[PDB]
Amino acid sequence: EEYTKFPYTIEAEDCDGAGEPWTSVYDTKIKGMYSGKGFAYLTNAPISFNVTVKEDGMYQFTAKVAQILDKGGRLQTISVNGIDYQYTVPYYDTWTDFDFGMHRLNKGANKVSFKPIYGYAEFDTITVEEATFPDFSKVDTKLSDPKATKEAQKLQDYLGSVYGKKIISGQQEIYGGGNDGDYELEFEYIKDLTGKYPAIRGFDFMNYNPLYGWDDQTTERVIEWVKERGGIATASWHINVPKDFDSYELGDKVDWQQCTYATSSTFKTADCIKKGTKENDYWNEAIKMLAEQLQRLQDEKVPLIFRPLHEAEGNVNTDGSGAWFWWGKAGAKTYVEIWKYLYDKLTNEYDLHNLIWEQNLYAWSPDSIQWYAGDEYVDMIGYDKYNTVYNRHDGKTSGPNLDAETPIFYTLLNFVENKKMISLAENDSIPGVDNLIIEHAAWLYFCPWYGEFILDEKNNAKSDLKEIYTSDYCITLEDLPFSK
Numbered sequence: 001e002e003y004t005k006f007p008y009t010i011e012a013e014d015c016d017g018a019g020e021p022w023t024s025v026y027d028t029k030i031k032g033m034y035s036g037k038g039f040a041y042l043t044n045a046p047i048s049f050n051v052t053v054k055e056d057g058m059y060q061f062t063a064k065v066a067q068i069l070d071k072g073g074r075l076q077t078i079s080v081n082g083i084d085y086q087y088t089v090p091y092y093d094t095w096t097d098f099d100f101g102m103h104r105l106n107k108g109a110n111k112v113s114f115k116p117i118y119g120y121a122e123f124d125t126i127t128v129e130e131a132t133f134p135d136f137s138k139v140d141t142k143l144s145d146p147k148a149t150k151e152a153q154k155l156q157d158y159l160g161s162v163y164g165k166k167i168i169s170g171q172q173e174i175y176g177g178g179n180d181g182d183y184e185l186e187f188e189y190i191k192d193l194t195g196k197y198p199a200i201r202g203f204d205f206m207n208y209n210p211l212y213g214w215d216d217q218t219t220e221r222v223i224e225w226v227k228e229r230g231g232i233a234t235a236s237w238h239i240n241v242p243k244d245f246d247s248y249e250l251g252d253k254v255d256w257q258q259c260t261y262a263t264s265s266t267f268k269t270a271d272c273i274k275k276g277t278k279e280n281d282y283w284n285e286a287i288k289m290l291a292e293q294l295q296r297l298q299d300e301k302v303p304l305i306f307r308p309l310h311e312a313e314g315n316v317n318t319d320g321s322g323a324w325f326w327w328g329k330a331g332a333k334t335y336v337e338i339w340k341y342l343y344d345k346l347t348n349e350y351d352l353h354n355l356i357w358e359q360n361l362y363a364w365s366p367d368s369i370q371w372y373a374g375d376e377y378v379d380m381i382g383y384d385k386y387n388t389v390y391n392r393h394d395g396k397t398s399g400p401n402l403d404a405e406t407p408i409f410y411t412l413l414n415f416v417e418n419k420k421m422i423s424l425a426e427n428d429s430i431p432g433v434d435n436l437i438i439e440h441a442a443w444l445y446f447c448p449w450y451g452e453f454i455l456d457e458k459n460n461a462k463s464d465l466k467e468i469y470t471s472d473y474c475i476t477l478e479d480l481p482f483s484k
């Protein structure tokens with residue numbers, strides 16, 4: 001088995017399945033000059049070549065291409081053995097270098113193919129190089145809030161210091177009242193199994209609301225985690241609205257069964273940021289009760305990775321039709337305005353500056369970036385990865401999905417042009433630690449949801465949990481600098 005020498009360039013016309021070299025797309029010449037005797041015209045049948053490597057590794061794929069069938073661009077597919085990666089190649093009437101991404105080559109032979117999905121593009125040469133990765137250490141971690149507290153900025157800088165070098169362990173605690181009051185169940189499970197505690201603990205402020213609000217002691221547990229155990233805190237905010245908002249009046253007691261965070265309410269999402277509306281009055285009351293708790297944290301000098309208004313896009317859309325939370329119901333543009341509203345309200349009116357603002361993004365399409373509030377309003381990008389049931393592409397149907405989802409990571413990275421750190425804010429399965437390292441899927445941290453998502457081996461196997469939690473690549477509670 002002779003091993004490929006890098007950089008490796010082939011004439012595409014020499015690929016398996018290419019046949020005799022082309023010199024024009026029938027009557028239409030590609031402008032410029034092709035290398036060699038001509039080019040490969042990929043129509044409805046694949047072209048391919050082999051690369052052999054000694055070990056698993058990441059490699060950069062580039063090709064000198066043209067594409068003259070579709071003025072608006074045409075989907076193309078590069079494939080490594082059995083795995084497909086999709087790229088949209090713009091209209092190119094002249095030979096142009098195109099970046100077909102960095103992908104994993106595995107030990108031994110690798111069939112690299114361009115598949116007819118959707119084909120009808122021209123290939124002059126193809127080049128394979130050893131991958132080069134973004135400089136994660138050079139990401140500027142100055143917080144977007146100019147008045148950010150010293151604790152918040154120091155936390156963000158610590159995160160930046162391990163970004164690309166490690167992944168930080170995390171775990172969401174149970175909803176208020178859950179586990180018959182035992183909020184430590186999930187955490188003691190991890191400890192007894194792996195010998196480690198997660199470094200990051202996930203919370204939620206949903207029960208501090210104007211409808212059925214009570215005191216589930218979240219704020220105290222956040223303080224306990226950070227100030228007494230030396231951990232890192234993150235928190236979401238599943239703030240509900242009344243289902244029947246027409247009959248609702250401010251101050252009404254509404255049972256949680258008659259509330260929702262979904263898209264089934266008569267609550268007009270777009271109006272929550274419009275002065276003089278009941279939507280706005282309720283939204284402001286909810287923000288007030290939230291800010292009250294966040295202020296307590298700021299008072300006790302506790303920084304927080306705050307992830308409000310999360311999973312905004314939901315399923316692929318920009319008009320709101322795919323969202324499953326009410327704040328995304330009115331579309332991307334309205335959603336971003338709502339995010340900015342909350343950001344401005346908390347930082348200016350409530351003078352809160354202890355927050356690291358994490359916004360969820362998805363990677364369904366390029367339009368997914370329309371749900372991004374911008375560099376000046378966001379400190380971190382979160383991805384919620386549930387791929388054990390839907391969106392599963394690891395070749396399995398059931399059980400743990402150990403896929404690193406590396407393409408999702410780099411899609412999100414390029415969205416923000418590597419100006420924000422990216423994490424797995426939520427997941428079912430934690431990716432395999434070997435997949436994370438080999439593929440350089442530099443997710444800042446991971447965080448299974450509560451209940452079955454950590455406790456059930458169909459989501460996370462015990463052997464995998466022990467392996468990643470005791471891995472040098474994974475930061476656990478003991479590894480943190482902060483005082484316990």
Ligand SMILES: [Ca+2]
Nearest residue numbers: 035036038124
């Ligand atoms: Ca050629």
